[PDB]
Paper text:
Mature vaccinia virus has more than 20 envelope proteins, including the A27 protein, which has multiple functions in the virus life cycle. During virus entry, A27 mediates the attachment of mature vaccinia virus to cell surface heparan sulfate. A27 also tethers a viral fusion suppressor protein, A26, to mature virions. During virion morphogenesis, A27 mediates mature virus transport in infected cells.
Hence, we further purified the tag-free A27 protein (aa 21–84, C71/72A, named as tA27) for X-ray crystallographic study. The tA27 protein was crystallized in the P43212 space group, and a native dataset was collected to 2.2 Å. Finally, the initial phases of tA27 protein were solved using multiple-wavelength anomalous diffraction analysis of tantalum bromide cluster derivative crystals. Monomers composed of tA27 protein fold into single α-helix structures and assemble further into a hexameric structure using a trimer (which corresponds to the crystallographic asymmetric unit) as a building block. The trimeric building block of tA27 contains unusual triple-stranded coiled-coil interactions with two parallel α-helices (chains A and B) and one antiparallel α-helical strand (chain C) using the N-terminal region interface (NTR Figure 1B). The antiparallel α-helix (chain C) uses its C-terminal region interface (CTR) to form a bridge-like structure that connects two trimers into a hexameric assembly. This unique type of parallel-to-antiparallel interaction within each trimer is distinct from the classical parallel trimeric coiled-coil structure common to other viral fusion proteins, such as influenza virus HA2, although the individual coiled-coil of tA27 and the heptad repeat of viral fusion proteins are structurally similar. Due to the intrinsic flexibility of HBD, its electron density maps (residues 21–44 for chains A and B; residues 21–43 for chain C) were not visible. In the CCD region, six hydrophobic residues, including Leu47, Leu51, Leu54, Ile58, Val61, and Phe65, are packed in six layers at the NTR, along with Ile68, Asn75, and Leu82 at the CTR. In addition, the Asn75 side chain OD1 of chain C forms two hydrogen bonds with the Asn75 NH2 of chains A′ and B′.
Author numbering:
A (entry chain A), B (entry chain B): 25 to 64
C (entry chain C): 22 to 64
The structure:
């Protein structure tokens, strides 16, 4: 496993984690929008 | 050097995701507290 | 993959990113050091 095989692997892992994380971000953002409408 | 750029990009993404993770976690607790106050 | 928590996965990923970065730094520094010895022998 070259340094470069490790880098490539980590780039993939960060991409998978980010996609998953982005779904949480969208739901968090929707939650703020819902609260905003309930508050006002 | 493309290795340096790759490493820098990977560091930035993991830092961005971990700081956003903390922010969203705080915001969800804060939203719960407001939602509690809206009822009571 | 594993029944790790998101937090564990991210912590693990931070550590691997840190290890590979450190590894790259050590290799670069090692190369410099070899070059310093070669420089001293060549002037």
């Amino acid at each position: 496993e070259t340094l470069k095989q490790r880098l490539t692997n980590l780039e993939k892992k960060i991409t998978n984690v980010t996609t998953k994380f982005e779904q949480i971000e969208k739901a968090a953002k929707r939650n703020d929008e819902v609260l905003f409408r309930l508050e006002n």
